[PDB]
Design a binder for this molecule. Structure first.
Ligand SMILES: Nc1ncnc2c1ncn2[C@@H]1O[C@H](COP(=O)(O)OP(=O)(O)O)[C@@H](O)[C@H]1O
Ligand SMILES: Nc1ncnc2c1ncn2[C@@H]1O[C@H](COP(=O)(O)OP(=O)(O)O)[C@@H](O)[C@H]1O
Ligand SMILES: Nc1ncnc2c1ncn2[C@@H]1O[C@H](COP(=O)(O)OP(=O)(O)O)[C@@H](O)[C@H]1O
Ligand SMILES: Nc1ncnc2c1ncn2[C@@H]1O[C@H](COP(=O)(O)OP(=O)(O)O)[C@@H](O)[C@H]1O
Ligand SMILES: Nc1ncnc2c1ncn2[C@@H]1O[C@H](COP(=O)(O)OP(=O)(O)O)[C@@H](O)[C@H]1O
Ligand SMILES: Nc1ncnc2c1ncn2[C@@H]1O[C@H](COP(=O)(O)OP(=O)(O)O)[C@@H](O)[C@H]1O
Ligand SMILES: Nc1ncnc2c1ncn2[C@@H]1O[C@H](COP(=O)(O)OP(=O)(O)O)[C@@H](O)[C@H]1O
Ligand SMILES: Nc1ncnc2c1ncn2[C@@H]1O[C@H](COP(=O)(O)OP(=O)(O)O)[C@@H](O)[C@H]1O
Lengths: 216, 216, 216, 216, 216, 216, 216, 216
């Protein structure tokens, strides 16, 4: 699979650097010479180009790539024009970073395959950790059920899983325990939990919160 | 708990709006009048203020708040100065959005309690989804272990959980199956999977990938 | 013919006000109540509406109009999305005011029927009037030929058309003379020109300038 | 004569670029470095300066220029303040772009020599072209008479000038024909008109419209 | 009747402080924080604000005040812009301190209701007292007539009013005599004057000087 | 008598220029060459000098002058230092313009003969005219008595002096009437007052105000 | 001896705090309540007072003190007035901190006993340490001779005093050596110097620099 | 070595003026026009610039300088912000003036190479001179030993260095005698001391003091 990342900023650069680490063919494209030089090490190839210019875009051989990521930030107009050009060149997947609701809409209309709101999405998750000091990370299975990574409190120190009757008191199941960085999966009822451990609980959203209120 | 969100941008605004939805006391603060007006519905109070001015911060009554979030983006100097002011006002928790590695370092030195990289973090997650079309979402328990939400292919159509002997062959456990919106938790070995369903697997990262290559 | 003018600014407002004077059915649409109130007198109907909202657009019954003018200025995003929305509603003629070179390109791509650059076009005309203080107004037939309205000097005072033999000496023709508001068309060779009158000459651009240098 | 253009916007930039093309000495002045860089090619000299600052204006040697154009747009205060300085320096001709009616009035009081409303003026012209799509361009001789450039229709295809007897039937005269970019001035009665040609007719406004309705 | 004093300097501060002493509603406005704190005691309300900024001016509720005094001194640009805003906001009475002759001209054109030259006026008044040691204070009724307060000399000691026939000999009338703090109004012909008393004479300027030269 | 004016500002300049009209020997002194050039016409002699420099002070022959006025403004130290220098040179009369209360105190201590507060004094007078729109000008004889110049209103239109019996009803006396610039002194009881005339009344401060409320 | 320190700033406060450590009677005086509160522990007495007010000055009984230090900083007017007042009370020693050249001059004239320029003096010393990284501290005996504390380099490691014969070669004498905190005074010719030790040399300024360039 | 001094105040200016005197390359930088103008004579180059602005700082070519001294006056934010930029530009040596204990801490954290307290340090030294009337200046070798410059009293008049048996009695050494400005270094036992001469003694602090008590 070949990847082209247009706009080597905070978002696009991270994508480029991460994709490269996984051992993928990644083309980094940026209008700023300094940006291109920086990511020369972190890309298969890095090229200075203006994505709004079709001739420059064609010069890259951009038609070859199955995934092209438009991560241009502050010039929303440049972002729009680029997406329009890429769609004209029949790029299979065009993923674009959006700046606002209106920008999301025009991208949606002009045929962006995937639209991303990095700041907006993270804002939600960080807010979850703000409201609940206990939650470290989570993943939602549905509207009602979820898997949550919790930070163990002192109330859970030296408690066993069978001691913490979570399937019966709360209808939830404990999936993992992380102790001093070492992790345990599908932990047995005899396993003990100590403070500052990572605890992975799975169940109904309301049920988990009750475990947090009463249990920890 | 009272929360103050300074800088109502894409990141800060989402935090504020989400915190407000959960029914928390949130103070929205921004130097731009237009930004403050927009989030008026989504905050307990919304105030036009310069966070770099010590006198203005006191007018807000910022000492009252347990959590103050500095989500100023493009002006690194204001972000730094604001963070610097808040520590002098002895704010318990100061969370700040960072723009680069160097900005992260100065925040760390001047006593920021939490430093966040929304664009950087999302870049990684999206890169994982770019490289592997099968993964919809994931959460990392540690460097080696993770919980992954997968999109079932036709190679997995009408296969049983005991058929996909994941607990022994790959050392991973399946946590959930989502079929037509209907959700199944901790599914039994007799349960069936149909294509384009969501599959939630838990285990070591390499083990999951092996399941992806060989199984699906 | 029905006309809809979206965005009651300097440009759009002038369009609406002038069209109304000619006795056309003109629908004035603006997001600002004050703007709508201002043009209540100068339109057939005036409505407060957000043009980026499809449901509001349908409430206007905008599909009926043969010409829709998008004159939103500072919000390039709204202009693009509105233009984009109007095309999906199959509006016959969509005229849009452009803010920059890139805005021009997206409008061209998303199917704007006519794109207008009011400032750029006036800049050209005013520059011509700057170099030649004598020219009041003009119209270009081509790159080389033009029709120009001139302000008569004392050098042309009490001069006859046959006296200023421009048809042979300069290969130019005098089309009209305006005296004290009274107008004369295709004036006879015996007709006199007085200073501070309006003089309309037609010919080659270089040839006209020769008349200005030598004649007046 | 030397020209100075303050404010390199859509209007000011166009003025400067066009004046430069005519081979005049034009000084491009703008407070934004990016604007100055852009018009460096299109000006004799380009300088970064704040026009509201008397010392910076003197550094330019602005007293030398016969014409100074203030094309600052969104900052009415800077536009006003700059204009005020120029009159103090006894600048011969001060032409200023106005943003609103009140701005027009203050400019008039403080001694602006010419006041321009680019958007407002174009609004009228575009409205004329909206009502009549046949007219390409025009110039008004008076309230009642005008010279109009028309887009020839099929009703005029392969028609001769003597065939379309406008001089007697409509009291109008045909001044020019533009065919294949090639231009014909004061055409003889035998000359033919083909569709999609430019036709320049002269007469009373009502009479021309009658020619448009009946003739084409 | 509400008063707003913009610019708390030597002049404006005195106005505000004196207006306050009479028990009027006075709003003290200054851009400097240090100035505002000082006149908090001597004003009904004192606010830190930039008077050139329309949004800050409206926050003051400046539309409410019948009289607004612009006493900004050294920044002629600020004085002008502030004055311009106030006329634009339709403030009934705008009194402005002028710095020079030209500043007087721009203020008059932009609609200042009263223009004051405190230093200029006092210079004249003090100069009169420099040239003539006898005059303590005076007031001009016209270009030619005045009322003057004189310091009685030894030549006037123990002189009666009927002795000094200023009413017939000099065409002037003595209005008052002030002796040891005790005051005499419209003194009778029998009343006596002693040296170093305050003497208030009324008449023509030339006639008073003749009384000073011949009489005193 | 010879006069030296040090510091040719708004205050000092006015003194010098006014003194010059009266035909006095005036030395204009200023550190700024441009100020000196301006007042060359308005002074007996004009010299560039630093008043804080003792050697320069002696070169002027400042010892010759009976009155030296220090009207330096923004550098309070220079004002103090010059005044301090002049007193050690035993200058007969040293008049100094003061910037604030503390500056008044040091000048008083170090032997300034007269201290002037031009802005402060005018502030008071202007405030009186602000509070009372009727008063044009005034002079105080004591704490309780004053002479006031009034602007006649319509309530005083076509009124005689005997009609407005202020001598008995208000215990005040009318001194003068000014009509269309024409002036009348010590007017007879038959004389009439019309609105927009100047009226000069003399009496107790409280009494005059009573006349203003009830009479006009 | 009793000391009075007026103005508890960086300068005055340090004086006050250090004098107290030596066990002297120190009166701390400041107009700011917070300043007085801060130095309550570090003074014999701490009093809130305005030093410019004579009645308050008498209330302190400041006439009793042999030394009064005026360390008021930002208000040059207060510093002058206070210093001026103290001389009226015939205070034996009045030491005052000066803000500029003019402030020094007036203080000199009004009888300040000692005038100090802390920033200016340190500015000189820091510049010496800036030019020469080797010098740690120094004291000037005159314009030409000095005693300097140096940081030993590797070039001086294990060198004897007789080895570095500075008394004849450079005309300088070594006064002391500091090794690992242990101190040696007037060291014998056999004593050794090691790097990173403190070295005290005495001689001509230029000669010492020659020793630094060639010797170390 | 090249030096840049930001903030031309009492401290920074003294540094700049002194470094320039030594014949060093010194860049004087200040936002105030007079300050830059004032030290123009005393610096290699002087530029008006805001040090908190990276672009203005880069225009200076600040990267060239080995030493940058931040003497911004009282805006701890400006001092902090400037210091922050210089560390980001990898400036070799960053010396900063601190305003308080807290300003010292932030400077320490953000990587100031040297932090200076001019007023505070001088306060200590001056306090030493206050307590001991004899000491003119001193330098501390350690907590217990010092080199001291004394002002000779009448008790030391016409005393010889063998007469003052300081060599044995007080364990102190006389290093220099300064007579009428002429200096004697390492003076011989026959040399005499006269009153009001400068005397440089070296030894233990308490022992030096006893010599002051008994000897002078
Ligand atoms: N026309 C263009 N062509 C190519 N790259 C561009 C163009 N315009 C901007 N960029 C690049 O996009 C990046 C801007 O991203 P940025 O504003 O940092 O957003 P974020 O930080 O959220 O990724 C910059 O690296 C810039 O070089
Ligand atoms: N000194 C300040 N005080 C308060 N708010 C500020 C200050 N400086 C900037 N801001 C606000 O912070 C916001 C930054 O948002 P933005 O950078 O767009 O977030 P993101 O980078 O996540 O999109 C801006 O809307 C701006 O108005
Ligand atoms: N979403 C929207 N829907 C309709 N009208 C809008 C919308 N957004 C802005 N406008 C209107 O467009 C106008 C823009 O005019 P302006 O840019 O000031 O003048 P011009 O563009 O003619 O130079 C504004 O008056 C505003 O009310
Ligand atoms: N104080 C100032 N001095 C000089 N140029 C200025 C000043 N303020 C604004 N400008 C310039 O005026 C220009 C305004 O252009 P713009 O408003 O975009 O075009 P238009 O007026 O046609 O809409 C900007 O390029 C800006 O740099
Ligand atoms: N934009 C502004 N808004 C409000 N006040 C201002 C503004 N600019 C200046 N000022 C104030 O105006 C005052 C000018 O006073 P000054 O020059 O001392 O006049 P005077 O000579 O009469 O004392 C200053 O105190 C300043 O704070
Ligand atoms: N040391 C000095 N010697 C002589 N004249 C000076 C000195 N310092 C300033 N001046 C002059 O004194 C005048 C000060 O007046 P200014 O500051 O305008 O106050 P104002 O306008 O209220 O009189 C200026 O013209 C200045 O050039
Ligand atoms: N009129 C006054 N009477 C007494 N103390 C004063 C007066 N004015 C100022 N001060 C004090 O003098 C101090 C000045 O110190 P500051 O200027 O902050 O630092 P520095 O001592 O370096 O100049 C202030 O702390 C203030 O409290
Ligand atoms: N951003 C800046 N860039 C350059 N110089 C500055 C800046 N901000 C302030 N300054 C200058 O720093 C100088 C130092 O102020 P001051 O209080 O005199 O300090 P000090 O007397 O201790 O040196 C001031 O003269 C001021 O003009």
């Amino acid at each position: 699979k070949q990847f082209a990342v247009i706009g080597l900023g905070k978002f696009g650069g991270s994508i480029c650097k991460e994709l490269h680490r996984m051992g993928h063919e990644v083309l980094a494209v940026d209008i700023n010479e300094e940006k291109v030089n920086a990511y020369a090490s972190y890309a298969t190839h890095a090229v200075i180009a203006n994505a709004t210019e079709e001739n420059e875009l064609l010069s890259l051989g951009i038609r070859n790539f199955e995934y092209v990521i438009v991560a241009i930030g502050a010039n929303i107009q440049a972002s729009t024009l680029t997406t329009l050009l890429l769609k004209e060149l029949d790029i299979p997947n065009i993923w674009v970073k959006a700046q606002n609701y209106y920008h999301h809409k025009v991208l949606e209309k002009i045929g962006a395959d995937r639209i991303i709101h990095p700041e907006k999405d993270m804002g939600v998750k960080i807010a979850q950790s703000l409201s609940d000091e206990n939650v470290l990370n989570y993943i939602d299975l549905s509207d009602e059920y979820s898997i949550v990574e919790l930070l163990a409190t002192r109330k859970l120190d030296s408690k066993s899983i069978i001691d913490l009757n979570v399937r019966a008191k709360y209808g939830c199941t404990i999936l993992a325990i992380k102790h001093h960085g070492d992790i345990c999966l599908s932990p047995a009822p005899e396993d003990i939990i100590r403070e500052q451990d990572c605890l992975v609980i799975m169940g109904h959203k309301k049920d988990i919160k009750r475990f947090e209120n009463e249990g920890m």
